[model samples]
Target: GSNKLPGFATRAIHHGYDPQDHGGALVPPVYQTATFTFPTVEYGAACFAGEQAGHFYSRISNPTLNLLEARMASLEGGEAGLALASGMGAITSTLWTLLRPGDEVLLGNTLYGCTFAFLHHGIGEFGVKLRHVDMADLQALEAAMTPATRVIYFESPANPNMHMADIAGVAKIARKHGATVVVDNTYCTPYLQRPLELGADLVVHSATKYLSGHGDITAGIVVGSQALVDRIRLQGLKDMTGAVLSPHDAALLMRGIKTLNLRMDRHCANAQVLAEFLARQPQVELIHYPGLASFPQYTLARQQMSQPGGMIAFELKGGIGAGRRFMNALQLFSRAVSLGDAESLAQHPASMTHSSYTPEERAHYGISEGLVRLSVGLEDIDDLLADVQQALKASA
Candidate 1:
């Protein structure tokens, strides 16, 4: 065989793990205990001092959790990884670690509700200057830099709207300004896109959605260079927030990721079909999906992502009332909030996900009252199209 090595699926199954190391057990065993025993006082002291590679406490580190972290880092093409209790915990901890009271954070114009809340309400109260700008506008993005700027945070194929940020372009500007660029890679997982390779300093994920696929677990992860991750792990994760993932959850996530490549392929296929169907519908005013030829950022999306991903958003001719009717009429799709699951889901952004923002604020971000966000699942393409068609007829 040639020296190209194994593929993604193979690495997902075997990375940072070995059955032979655990008495030949096929599955990874959860280290459920809160603490680990040390061979001697010297060994314990060595472990605490970072002189040896061993577990001292579950809060600080563990065998099962270590395996998950290592595997995530490998997947994201980063030096190290940190698994946190929830997506918000990962986001907050990263910001808390990197920012000081007097620093500034430049953010993308459109963002998830909770993310906007944390930056605008939580951290903004601490006196950190925050500015939101259209990240795709290279001139505006470069002009927003200031002496106090410390972090540049944004998402690609952004929430609700599917606005694809030019990752490498913004990263280059950040480098010149001596600011760290943090990208939220939840929409397109490491299987689809690796932002670190595009010059992003750190990548964050809401592992609850995709990494654990089944909607049964909630977790978060951050990947970056060892020095940066260590600072977050010790200072923010351990001391300030203390939101560490459990061993059992870590094991489940590891198992779920083994089938990521498989699920994502089906997700992309289904989404492409759904996007095409919606674009032709008489009731659909507009569609936002990178897979479609009419998408505004199709070129940039193709450059950064391996696939268009499973998320799709569009506007109906009937506005909010029509959106409600459509969601209520759906038989196969769940009327839910979260995305990235095996079952298709649909929700109205104005009332469901982005309810926190006022009408004016929502309009500023281009999220209309009729906007419907769909997380295309692994269901058969024909079945999904039929359900959507029926809903459109009823809603119209």
Candidate 2:
């Protein structure tokens, strides 16, 4: 058996597996028990006390979840990965693990609304200090870093609009300041980019959208070096804050992750065609897709990603009024919040995800009233384009 040498796609199918056990089942069975029983007092003590490797509890450890974690970690080029119940859960728990009270973390202003909510309402209430700034400006990032700053959190091809941050540049600055950098790798996925190799301390993902491929399961992943992940496991998030993923969800996520690279490939090709079509429209003000050669970060995107992503954000020439009309006219694309699914989806950031932020705050992050985020799906290119064309006519 040639192990540790398979390609990513092949490894995704076979990693952390043994077919000889359990009647030659190729995949792991969902170990759905809430708590695991020990064989004896000595065995129980060893497991519970961390003296040996065994499943002491389902929440802390599960065979199904462990398999998924291992595969995801390896895919991210990290020593290990941890699966969470939901994307937000991963974000909250990971930030909680890394940040201390009164410790400052510099963040990109164009982050997911839920992430900002966590920093301002969820984590800020706990007495932790955070600074949000424009990620495009390296000078602003450098200025924000102080001795008290322990981490920097950001996303490339960010939620709502496809804004990019300089991952390598930020990592270099963080190295100089001894600050850990965490990135939300949800939008691009590991197949497209790996932040760890670029000097990021950690990478996080909302596996619900793309990793699962289908929208049925909710999941998230955090990946990093073994030493760093161990710190999170032992002293940070493991025991003190319990937010482990269920075995069934973990299994579901694993099933979806196996085909992530292929699906992303299709998504990229389709999204590029649609994005260019939209940009040519007279009614379209600005089209934001890092895949576009016109994008400010196009070169960086090509450098960091194997493929551009499925997301495309743009503004209507007529602003919010036209935007609402445009969203209502869509027949194939569902007008909804959330992203990273096989089906096309659309949502107004000002109304849905970014509604929590004030008007002033929203504008500051480049989320305007007319802005719409579209998740291009794996449909026939002509059909998808035709649907969009008809929808635009209706909006007019």
Candidate with maximal lDDT: 1
- Tell me the whole-model lDDT of each prediction, alpha carbons only: 0.90, 0.83
Candidate 2's displacement at residue 304, Å, is 1.0
Task: List runs of model 1 lying over 4 Å from the truth.
Answer: 1-5, 351-366
TM-scores for all candidates? Answer: 0.96, 0.93
Steric clashes per prediction: 0, 1
Residue 396, candidate 2: alpha-carbon lDDT: 75
Evaluated with TM-score, which candidate comes out highest?
Answer: 1
Where model 2 places Cα greater than 4 Å from the true spot, the runs are: 1-4, 234-241, 350-365
Model 2 per-residue lDDT tens digits across residues 1-396: 754567889878888788887578767778988888878889888975767888876666678887888998888888888877778877787888888898998888767878888888888889899788888789988988889999899888776566778889989999998999999999888888989988898998999889999889888788998877766665445755666777877888888888888889999999999998999987888888887888878987888888888998888877667777888888889988777788898888776667677768876776687788889988788988988888787667
Instruction: Please give the range of 10 consecutive residues that has the lowest summed lDDT in model 2.
Output: 232-241
Clash-forming residue pairs, model 1: none
